[PDB]
């Protein structure tokens, strides 16, 4: 499924990402569109240490979720990569949580750190009622 930004930012914050950690809603909706463009089952195959981001937030398998190929895997988050591809984002949801509890927080996605930090954000839940 690809979320338009709205229906996103709602469903974001009725599964209680808003401040999670001490990243505000705009934040996260920042990383989705970065990282997936808002897209459910967006992969993302990393030739160089052979392990795959998985879905709407690009979680990765090294770490918070099992997807069996991974070479010196761990399930921190204890979720099948397959759970991160649904409609539903629920799961992808309770793993993201799951990452920030690391003391990087936010900061675990390369990307978040390149387009998201110290800018403005709120054009990403402006307008969608949150």
């Given at each position: 499924?690809?979320?338009?930004?709205?229906?996103?930012?709602?469903?974001?914050?009725?599964?209680?990402?808003?401040?999670?950690?001490?990243?505000?809603?705009?934040?996260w909706?920042?990383?989705?569109?970065?990282?997936?463009?808002?897209?459910?089952?967006?992969?993302?195959?990393?030739?160089?240490?052979?392990?795959?981001?998985?879905?709407?937030?690009?979680?990765?398998?090294?770490?918070?979720?099992?997807?069996?190929?991974?070479?010196?895997?761990?399930?921190?988050?204890?979720?099948?990569?397959?759970?991160?591809?649904?409609?539903?984002?629920?799961?992808?949801?309770?793993?993201?949580?799951?990452?920030?509890?690391?003391?990087?927080?936010?900061?675990?996605?390369v990307?978040?750190?390149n387009?998201?930090?110290?800018?403005?954000?709120?054009?990403?839940?402006?307008?969608?009622?949150?």
């Amino acid at each position: 499924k690809v979320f338009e930004r709205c229906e996103l930012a709602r469903t974001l914050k009725r599964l209680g990402m808003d401040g999670y950690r001490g990243i505000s809603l705009a934040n996260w909706m920042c990383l989705a569109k970065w990282e997936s463009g808002y897209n459910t089952r967006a992969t993302n195959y990393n030739a160089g240490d052979r392990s795959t981001d998985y879905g709407i937030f690009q979680i990765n398998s090294r770490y918070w979720c099992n997807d069996g190929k991974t070479p010196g895997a761990v399930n921190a988050a204890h979720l099948s990569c397959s759970a991160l591809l649904q409609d539903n984002i629920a799961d992808a949801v309770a793993a993201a949580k799951r990452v920030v509890r690391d003391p990087q927080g936010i900061r675990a996605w390369v990307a978040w750190r390149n387009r998201c930090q110290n800018r403005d954000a709120r054009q990403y839940v402006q307008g969608c009622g949150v």
